């Protein structure tokens, strides 16, 4: 599947859905915490 990227709106769309999708999966690795220590921060991506 090719996908051309025009401007900052296109990389906004694709890079936003990939970046916030993977960050969202790390949030699903944050709520689903470790079995031993709840007081340990998971590696999470930055805000924006």
């Amino acid at each position: 599947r090719p996908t051309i990227l025009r401007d900052g709106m296109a990389a906004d769309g694709v890079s936003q859905r990939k970046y916030n999708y993977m960050r969202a999966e790390q949030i699903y690795r944050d709520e689903q915490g470790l079995s031993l220590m709840p007081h340990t921060a998971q590696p999470i991506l930055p805000a924006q």
């Binding site: 599947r1 090719p2 996908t3 051309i4 990227l5 025009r6 694709v14």
Partner: protein, 83 residues
């Protein structure tokens, strides 16, 4: 005055000099096209009639390049059962 310096806005300089060694070299039918690699500029030394031609070509080649995200999927389904 005689020679000028063009700052390329979307392309590398060495590619443009590798193209433009061929345009002036028979367009004269002297000329100097040299590319400052560290500072992103090619230098045209030409008479006034050739200068508008090469200026027009540099104006037509310094263009925004689009970018393509390619996503290739792979599916493999197997099934094996022997009695």
């Amino acid at each position: 005055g005689n020679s000028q310096v063009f700052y390329l806005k979307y392309s590398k300089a060495e590619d443009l000099v590798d193209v433009l060694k061929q345009v002036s070299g028979t367009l004269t039918a002297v000329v100097s096209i040299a590319a400052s690699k560290h500072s992103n500029a090619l230098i045209v030394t030409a008479p006034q009639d050739i200068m508008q031609s090469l200026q027009s070509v540099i104006e037509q080649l310094d263009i925004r390049r689009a970018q393509v995200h390619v996503e290739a999927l792979i599916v493999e389904v197997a099934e094996g059962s022997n009695i």
